Design an enzyme around this catalytic site. Structure first.
Site, PDB file in Angstrom:
ATOM      1  N   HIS A 247      50.013  42.430  43.476  1.00 16.50           N
ATOM      2  CA  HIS A 247      50.012  40.951  43.512  1.00 16.50           C
ATOM      3  C   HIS A 247      51.034  40.390  42.508  1.00 16.50           C
ATOM      4  O   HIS A 247      50.894  39.241  42.016  1.00 16.50           O
ATOM      5  CB  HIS A 247      48.590  40.390  43.268  1.00 16.50           C
ATOM      6  CG  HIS A 247      47.663  40.569  44.453  1.00 16.50           C
ATOM      7  ND1 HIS A 247      46.305  40.276  44.401  1.00 16.50           N
ATOM      8  CD2 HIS A 247      47.908  41.041  45.704  1.00 16.50           C
ATOM      9  CE1 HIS A 247      45.772  40.504  45.605  1.00 16.50           C
ATOM     10  NE2 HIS A 247      46.706  41.019  46.395  1.00 16.50           N
TER      11      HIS A 247
ATOM     12  N   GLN B  27      36.021  40.103  46.015  1.00 10.68           N
ATOM     13  CA  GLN B  27      35.909  40.588  47.389  1.00 10.68           C
ATOM     14  C   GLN B  27      34.837  41.635  47.362  1.00 10.68           C
ATOM     15  O   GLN B  27      34.860  42.585  46.519  1.00 10.68           O
ATOM     16  CB  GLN B  27      37.243  41.203  47.867  1.00 10.68           C
ATOM     17  CG  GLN B  27      38.230  40.087  48.079  1.00 10.68           C
ATOM     18  CD  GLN B  27      39.613  40.469  48.554  1.00 10.68           C
ATOM     19  OE1 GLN B  27      40.509  39.587  48.581  1.00 10.68           O
ATOM     20  NE2 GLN B  27      39.833  41.762  48.872  1.00 10.68           N
TER      21      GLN B  27
ATOM     22  N   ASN C 183      44.448  36.153  46.186  1.00 14.11           N
ATOM     23  CA  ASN C 183      45.506  36.955  46.765  1.00 14.11           C
ATOM     24  C   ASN C 183      46.648  35.951  47.058  1.00 14.11           C
ATOM     25  O   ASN C 183      46.380  34.848  47.560  1.00 14.11           O
ATOM     26  CB  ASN C 183      45.090  37.590  48.057  1.00 14.11           C
ATOM     27  CG  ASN C 183      43.661  38.091  48.042  1.00 14.11           C
ATOM     28  OD1 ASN C 183      42.744  37.317  47.962  1.00 14.11           O
ATOM     29  ND2 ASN C 183      43.489  39.388  48.144  1.00 14.11           N
TER      30      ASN C 183
ATOM     31  N   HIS D  22      33.076  43.886  50.036  1.00 16.73           N
ATOM     32  CA  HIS D  22      33.545  44.085  51.386  1.00 16.73           C
ATOM     33  C   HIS D  22      33.712  45.564  51.651  1.00 16.73           C
ATOM     34  O   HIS D  22      33.170  46.379  50.904  1.00 16.73           O
ATOM     35  CB  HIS D  22      34.866  43.315  51.587  1.00 16.73           C
ATOM     36  CG  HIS D  22      35.974  43.812  50.714  1.00 16.73           C
ATOM     37  ND1 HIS D  22      37.261  43.913  51.161  1.00 16.73           N
ATOM     38  CD2 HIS D  22      35.969  44.300  49.437  1.00 16.73           C
ATOM     39  CE1 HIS D  22      38.031  44.387  50.189  1.00 16.73           C
ATOM     40  NE2 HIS D  22      37.270  44.641  49.134  1.00 16.73           N
TER      41      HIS D  22
HETATM   42  C1  LIG Z   1      47.548  47.760  51.110  1.00 20.81           C
HETATM   43  C2  LIG Z   1      47.945  46.319  50.781  1.00 20.81           C
HETATM   44  C3  LIG Z   1      46.994  45.348  50.895  1.00 20.81           C
HETATM   45  C4  LIG Z   1      47.347  44.013  50.654  1.00 20.81           C
HETATM   46  N1  LIG Z   1      46.384  43.051  50.829  1.00 20.81           N
HETATM   47  C5  LIG Z   1      46.651  41.718  50.634  1.00 20.81           C
HETATM   48  C6  LIG Z   1      45.720  40.732  50.891  1.00 20.81           C
HETATM   49  O1  LIG Z   1      44.601  40.954  51.426  1.00 20.81           O
HETATM   50  N2  LIG Z   1      46.098  39.414  50.684  1.00 20.81           N
HETATM   51  C7  LIG Z   1      47.356  39.072  50.246  1.00 20.81           C
HETATM   52  O2  LIG Z   1      47.664  37.899  50.068  1.00 20.81           O
HETATM   53  N3  LIG Z   1      48.281  40.025  50.037  1.00 20.81           N
HETATM   54  C8  LIG Z   1      47.954  41.358  50.240  1.00 20.81           C
HETATM   55  N4  LIG Z   1      48.948  42.301  50.065  1.00 20.81           N
HETATM   56  C9  LIG Z   1      50.222  41.824  49.395  1.00 20.81           C
HETATM   57  C10 LIG Z   1      51.050  41.216  50.538  1.00 20.81           C
HETATM   58  O3  LIG Z   1      51.248  42.178  51.554  1.00 20.81           O
HETATM   59  C11 LIG Z   1      52.428  40.784  50.069  1.00 20.81           C
HETATM   60  O4  LIG Z   1      52.172  39.710  49.164  1.00 20.81           O
HETATM   61  C12 LIG Z   1      53.298  40.217  51.213  1.00 20.81           C
HETATM   62  O5  LIG Z   1      53.554  41.163  52.265  1.00 20.81           O
HETATM   63  C13 LIG Z   1      54.643  39.740  50.640  1.00 20.81           C
HETATM   64  O6  LIG Z   1      55.396  39.314  51.760  1.00 20.81           O
HETATM   65  P1  LIG Z   1      56.974  39.314  51.598  1.00 20.81           P
HETATM   66  O7  LIG Z   1      57.596  38.870  52.831  1.00 20.81           O
HETATM   67  O8  LIG Z   1      57.488  38.533  50.442  1.00 20.81           O
HETATM   68  O9  LIG Z   1      57.497  40.764  51.116  1.00 20.81           O
HETATM   69  P2  LIG Z   1      57.216  42.181  51.874  1.00 20.81           P
HETATM   70  O10 LIG Z   1      55.992  42.208  52.781  1.00 20.81           O
HETATM   71  O11 LIG Z   1      57.244  43.071  50.744  1.00 20.81           O
HETATM   72  O12 LIG Z   1      58.633  42.338  52.644  1.00 20.81           O
HETATM   73  C14 LIG Z   1      59.861  42.569  52.020  1.00 20.81           C
HETATM   74  C15 LIG Z   1      60.781  43.226  53.033  1.00 20.81           C
HETATM   75  O13 LIG Z   1      62.094  43.348  52.531  1.00 20.81           O
HETATM   76  C16 LIG Z   1      62.622  44.608  52.880  1.00 20.81           C
HETATM   77  N5  LIG Z   1      63.668  45.062  51.928  1.00 20.81           N
HETATM   78  C17 LIG Z   1      63.488  45.582  50.677  1.00 20.81           C
HETATM   79  N6  LIG Z   1      64.697  45.876  50.142  1.00 20.81           N
HETATM   80  C18 LIG Z   1      65.646  45.563  51.032  1.00 20.81           C
HETATM   81  C19 LIG Z   1      67.031  45.658  50.984  1.00 20.81           C
HETATM   82  N7  LIG Z   1      67.646  45.790  49.807  1.00 20.81           N
HETATM   83  N8  LIG Z   1      67.747  45.228  52.077  1.00 20.81           N
HETATM   84  C20 LIG Z   1      67.107  44.722  53.201  1.00 20.81           C
HETATM   85  N9  LIG Z   1      65.731  44.638  53.229  1.00 20.81           N
HETATM   86  C21 LIG Z   1      65.014  45.042  52.160  1.00 20.81           C
HETATM   87  C22 LIG Z   1      61.422  45.523  52.858  1.00 20.81           C
HETATM   88  O14 LIG Z   1      61.594  46.588  53.741  1.00 20.81           O
HETATM   89  C23 LIG Z   1      60.305  44.628  53.321  1.00 20.81           C
HETATM   90  O15 LIG Z   1      60.140  44.718  54.704  1.00 20.81           O
HETATM   91  C24 LIG Z   1      48.660  43.650  50.296  1.00 20.81           C
HETATM   92  C25 LIG Z   1      49.610  44.629  50.178  1.00 20.81           C
HETATM   93  C26 LIG Z   1      49.265  45.948  50.442  1.00 20.81           C
HETATM   94  C27 LIG Z   1      50.378  46.966  50.633  1.00 20.81           C
HETATM   95  O1  LIG Z   2      44.458  47.568  46.538  1.00 24.42           O
HETATM   96  C1  LIG Z   2      44.665  46.220  46.092  1.00 24.42           C
HETATM   97  C2  LIG Z   2      44.433  45.322  47.308  1.00 24.42           C
HETATM   98  O2  LIG Z   2      43.071  45.449  47.801  1.00 24.42           O
HETATM   99  C3  LIG Z   2      42.510  44.463  48.679  1.00 24.42           C
HETATM  100  O3  LIG Z   2      41.123  44.641  48.845  1.00 24.42           O
HETATM  101  C4  LIG Z   2      43.068  43.028  48.634  1.00 24.42           C
HETATM  102  F1  LIG Z   2      42.652  42.110  49.564  1.00 24.42           F
HETATM  103  C5  LIG Z   2      44.530  42.919  48.206  1.00 24.42           C
HETATM  104  O4  LIG Z   2      45.007  41.631  48.114  1.00 24.42           O
HETATM  105  C6  LIG Z   2      45.137  43.954  47.277  1.00 24.42           C
HETATM  106  O5  LIG Z   2      46.560  44.047  47.394  1.00 24.42           O
END
Ligand SMILES: Cc1cc2nc3c(=O)[nH]c(=O)nc-3n(C[C@H](O)[C@H](O)[C@H](O)COP(=O)(O)OP(=O)(O)OC[C@H]3O[C@@H](n4cnc5c(N)ncnc54)[C@H](O)[C@@H]3O)c2cc1C
Ligand SMILES: OC[C@H]1O[C@@H](O)[C@H](F)[C@@H](O)[C@@H]1O
Ligand SMILES: Cc1cc2nc3c(=O)[nH]c(=O)nc-3n(C[C@H](O)[C@H](O)[C@H](O)COP(=O)(O)OP(=O)(O)OC[C@H]3O[C@@H](n4cnc5c(N)ncnc54)[C@H](O)[C@@H]3O)c2cc1C
Ligand SMILES: OC[C@H]1O[C@@H](O)[C@H](F)[C@@H](O)[C@@H]1O
Ligand SMILES: OC[C@H]1O[C@@H](O)[C@H](F)[C@@H](O)[C@@H]1O
EC number: 1.1.3.10
Lengths: 577, 577, 52, 104
Positions: B506, B406, B551, B408
């Protein structure tokens, strides 16, 4: 969206919400605009710290605060980077870059000043300390009758305190709070009084405090609704209010010009009564952009036609800060009443106390907590329970120590090395000085540079006045060093220091109140009505004309209450047809 | 809150929302529990970067990210503070303080791993990059038939892309985007292909991009409602899900045990289908707390009765990063089609070009933006428009360059010295490595220490595997150094570096998918169904069993869609009553 | 330390770093005046600042 | 292991060491003042190619030590200044100050 209301309010912080609570409640058709958006969950304009996750991870909240504070005036950056690659494109000059303000003298700034644009304003993140001002800090509401003045301020503050739900009891059973409060009470016996900081907050459980906010004052739901079927209120987020339109006679406002940031549409809204509660900086900006005061670099050879004191006499507080690490003596005193049989972790270890004995230095509630903590966590070397609440202590401003003080814990970002120190040991110290209003201290607006919303760019010309303000600020630093030492030594990394000017965010005086425009060098009267104008009111700390050290929001709210009484007595609500 | 639903979903992140969208849409009666709270404005679970304020102040968004990321495992701190005052209480040891995890070996950690607890999960703050995995990175869905495996992935990814609103055209006319894109295309002609990063986003105007989130996938509004009168869905925030209850035969889940965080009460909920989408770390925690796998430090002498692969083979990507300042040559190229005459600020300054001329190196849309910027801002020494959007360039993972890239700009907190460099010059570089799944790399849970929600403390035992993983990580670093020098030299303060392990977020393989539990060392099948259990499903990057550099979220959503196909064929929605 | 102790910088431009956390009582500059052996001839952007 | 790669810099008339007629140094001598930038063209391209060469070559031995990442040093830190009184065969033709016996 109609374009005709009884009352329009610019800004949804706690001061706009005070006008709303009063005027919606009295039956006026109210619109409120806020340039920011709804972002505290389903309780609109509520405190962002009231999530379970933040109260379990309080130090993370510092990021929430930082994320919504946008610097008011940033001077042009002249830092030299001389380790770029030779191939990288490079400046021959420190040109205007990155949203910096070329009007800004970097040595006469309030570099710490910032604004927030969200529904709820700064009250979605504030620390909730709401002390009253004593007379020496307080503007007069009644001339030549001290007792009548006092009574009026009492009635207003009592009402403001109810709106915010201010209390002094939410931390009463904290071991740390009582440890510090009792020690300082003893040390200054006969000399200063100490108490809990008055806090706008209600405790809900031993591990949860519901901090108050704009939402506490007024819930910001559109009315009529099920619980308020006779009330009329609409909130419009993401609407930049840009100007109030003056009639030719400068006796009345005729409309409010807005810009809806989502649709892009630009309208004129009509109301009987126009209220500006956009904060100390943005009220002034809106006024200057509407033809009040003077646009551009102050030129006293061309004094302005309207509100010549607008943007002059600004005050910001000096703030000093440190943290301490609780003394051995105090920590040992926590377990003074315990008899300790044996060795921690080993088979027969006992910590016990005699309930209600008279040699006991501590109440039974304390000793019981300390007992269960030492018995249940034999691997832990401190007598303070893990979930024991923060200290929240103050000695309030007085002539002999004319600064506000807070000896407490708020959200903090500790360095790695600081995280080496157990948080039960740490206490923040913040002492706040009062600043003399001086005509040369100014907030002004560029006639060429614009901010992120294409409005005239705010520029400060400020220094702490010589004389009493500077002497007291230094006296105040010494006082913090002397008093803090009674509790513990300085935490390395948080040594005594003055904070960046304006970081404290207690800016006042930008559109200041007084009895007489000319004699008192002011912009609004005691009803918060702009001089000369029948139907324009300002609310907020910008009204406060005095030198004050205590946190100003309760005082601003009290003034807004008084302002609404004038409105109720002078404007008739529309019939609810 | 009913006692019985057709489907319960734990977690409101984008994966939980995929199950919601599919199952709510098919007529099931669904409840979703999230431990965190609504705080994204009126659009529940939406991206927090979509406010006008963050689109005008994009670097402030870094604070929003940091404010909701809580570290998964923090080892005991052994930093020495030896400059306390003699009076301050001092430790004799490095005892367990400040929520540190004494199970955690500090040299075998993912110290940068962190979790979010808010409605929408990490999708309220994510970067929105959603590339597909090529075959090399991708788990098999169909064995012994690559063409059918290909077709199935294509169908699932196409649907997941529609749910996220993935596109590759939201930055197509940014000057900086095309400047980098075209340069890299030329430099690698015949060797690698460059394109826009596939982003889950829709452009709404020249300065506004609506980033996708959980909300885009499913709006999280209770149903029935006016727009979905026949659908049934309830969301329950601030509810910590604590256990799924196994029958004695380990063949079925009998209920879900929850802890309502506001009332403090604990309840059981019954469903026909239980779906766990709490993220790669908390899905595993919930399972372990429910008797799957092994609680405590793993011990081969005593292998777990259920899912012995749970919490093993975990993968996390290596991540290298730098920033660059655009080369003089490239900047000069921006205005290569211009005819420049006179000098800036003077009446005879002229910047012109010939629209449509064959010799132009750039299209007319680029030249016109450049001309207008240079004519309207003659004091600015750069030809790039102030409001020119960010580059968003990638060369996707290939066997000859087995890392995702990336090139960007995302939100960043620049130091004061870095702020000296005009942002139009700055490009971020992030290259992501794949990590071989290895049985010894583990996420396990303490039988003694608990987290802030009183659940078993997560602990990592992780190192990047020797061999291919390590070799490619170092080669990846080299490639970033070589490729980035084509665009400009490094920005001081953001020199090429590996990021703290797990900061990339990740994490995969914690509850991994495969065809056969024993042969493929896995926990769920290709329907995401837990082996042996009729009615328990897991969604999220924890399912992904391969070494991947791209990702992962889009791939996890694709598996969730396939899972929902199985559910819809095997369970019947209750009658609508 | 020995090396550093004997390398005397050839030309140090006027310093323009802002210190805005002095106490109000401390004497404070209204300009970035020539202070501390700095060379007002030196353009800080065309220097060999590491020359000693 | 430390890595230091040193680039050559093209002599250009505009790159100068000159002395103030007002400001003096600690010994009351005319204060030295530089007017220097790395020349565009060859010097600059080769500097950035040298950086990349260091990145590529160092990786054969091991990865970077955190806190000592690849970086250009402050101009002149290297203390390899030349050309301030340079040698040539002809004062005018070779733009120089001393001949090949180093005589002025
Ligand atoms: C800054 C940042 C940038 C990112 N950029 C990218 C990207 O560009 N591309 C990409 O593919 N991925 C990216 N990600 C990773 C991506 O966000 C995650 O892979 C994705 O959100 C996973 O989705 P999910 O539903 O499995 O879990 P999450 O989004 O983690 O959701 C899990 C949920 O479960 C809830 N939970 C936890 N424990 C409990 C409990 N015991 N009881 C009830 N609820 C609970 C949490 O509150 C949360 O809301 C990024 C992450 C971050 C933070
Ligand atoms: O800080 C790490 C992150 O940076 C971004 O630029 C990505 F797109 C993500 O997938 C990742 O979670
Ligand atoms: C971290 C922090 C801690 C604090 N702690 C305390 C404390 O303990 N005690 C205390 O008394 N005070 C404290 N304060 C200060 C306190 O929050 C403010 O005094 C109070 O919020 C001011 O209220 P207000 O309604 O006048 O303005 P604000 O809360 O600033 O609200 C003004 C509103 O107007 C809006 N606005 C701005 N421009 C426009 C525009 N052009 N068009 C439409 N709307 C616009 C903004 O979005 C904002 O919502 C603290 C502040 C900060 C941020
Ligand atoms: O950081 C400055 C702030 O810190 C707190 O302790 C106060 F209570 C506030 O009044 C203030 O605005
Ligand atoms: O720091 C710069 C110096 O470092 C050394 O490695 C060299 F050998 C020198 O020629 C030089 O002066």
């Amino acid at each position: 969206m109609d374009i005709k209301y009884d009352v329009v309010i610019v800004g949804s912080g706690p001061i706009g919400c005070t006008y709303a609570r009063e005027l919606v409640g009295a039956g006026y058709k109210v619109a409120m605009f806020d340039i920011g958006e709804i972002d505290s969950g389903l309780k609109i304009g509520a405190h962002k710290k009231n999530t379970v996750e933040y109260q379990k991870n309080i130090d993370k909240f510092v990021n929430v605060i930082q994320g919504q504070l946008m610097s008011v005036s940033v001077p042009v950056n002249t830092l030299v980077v001389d380790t770029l690659s030779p191939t990288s494109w490079q400046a021959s000059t420190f040109f205007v870059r990155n949203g910096s303000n070329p009007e800004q003298d970097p040595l006469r700034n309030l570099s710490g000043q910032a604004v927030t644009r969200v529904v709820g304003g700064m009250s979605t993140a504030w620390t909730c300390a709401t002390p009253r001002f004593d007379r020496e800090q307080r503007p007069l509401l009644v001339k030549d009758d001290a007792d009548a003045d006092d009574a009026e301020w009492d009635r207003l503050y009592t009402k403001a305190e109810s709106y915010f739900q201010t209390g002094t009891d939410q931390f009463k059973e904290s071991i740390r709070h009582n440890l510090v409060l009792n020690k300082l009470t003893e040390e200054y016996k006969g000399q200063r009084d100490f108490q809990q900081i008055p806090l706008a907050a209600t405790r809900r459980s031993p591990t949860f405090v519901e901090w108050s906010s704009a939402n506490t004052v007024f819930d910001l739901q559109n009315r009529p609704n099920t619980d308020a079927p006779e009330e009329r209120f609409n909130l419009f987020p993401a609407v930049a209010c840009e100007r109030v339109v003056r009639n030719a006679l400068n006796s009345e406002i005729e409309s409010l010009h807005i810009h809806d940031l989502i649709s892009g549409d630009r309208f004129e809204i009509k109301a009987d009564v126009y209220v500006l509660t956009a904060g100390a900086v943005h009220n002034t900006q809106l006024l200057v952009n509407s033809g009040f005061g003077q646009l551009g670099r102050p030129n006293p050879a061309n004094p302005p036609e309207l509100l010549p004191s607008l943007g002059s006499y600004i005050t910001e507080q000096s703030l000093v800060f440190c943290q301490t690490v609780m003394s051995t003596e105090l920590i040992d005193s926590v377990k003074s009443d315990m008899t300790i049989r044996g060795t921690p972790g080993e088979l027969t270890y006992s910590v016990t106390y005699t309930p209600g004995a008279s040699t006991n230095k501590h109440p039974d509630w304390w000793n019981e907590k300390v007992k269960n903590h030492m018995m249940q966590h034999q691997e832990d070397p401190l007598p303070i329970p893990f979930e024991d609440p923060e200290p929240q202590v103050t000695t309030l401003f007085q002539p002999s120590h004319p600064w506000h003080t807070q000896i407490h814990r708020d959200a903090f970002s500790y360095g790695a090395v600081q995280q080496s120190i157990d948080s039960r040991l740490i206490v923040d110290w913040r002492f706040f000085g009062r600043t003399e209003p001086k005509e040369e201290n100014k907030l002004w607006f560029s006639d060429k540079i614009t901010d992120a919303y294409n409005m005239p760019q705010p520029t400060f010309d400020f220094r702490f006045p010589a004389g009493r303000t500077s002497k007291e600020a230094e006296d105040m630093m010494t006082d913090m060093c002397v008093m803090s030492a009674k509790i513990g030594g300085f935490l390395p990394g948080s040594l005594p220091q003055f904070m960046e000017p304006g970081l404290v965010l207690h800016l006042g005086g930008t559109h200041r109140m007084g009895f007489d425009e000319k004699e008192d060098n002011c912009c609004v009267n005691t009803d918060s009505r702009v001089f000369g104008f029948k139907n324009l009111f300002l609310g907020g700390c910008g009204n406060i004309p005095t030198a004050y050290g205590a946190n100003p929001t309760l005082t601003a709210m009290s003034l807004a209450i008084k302002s609404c009484e004038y409105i109720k007595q002078n404007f008739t609500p529309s019939p609810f047809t």
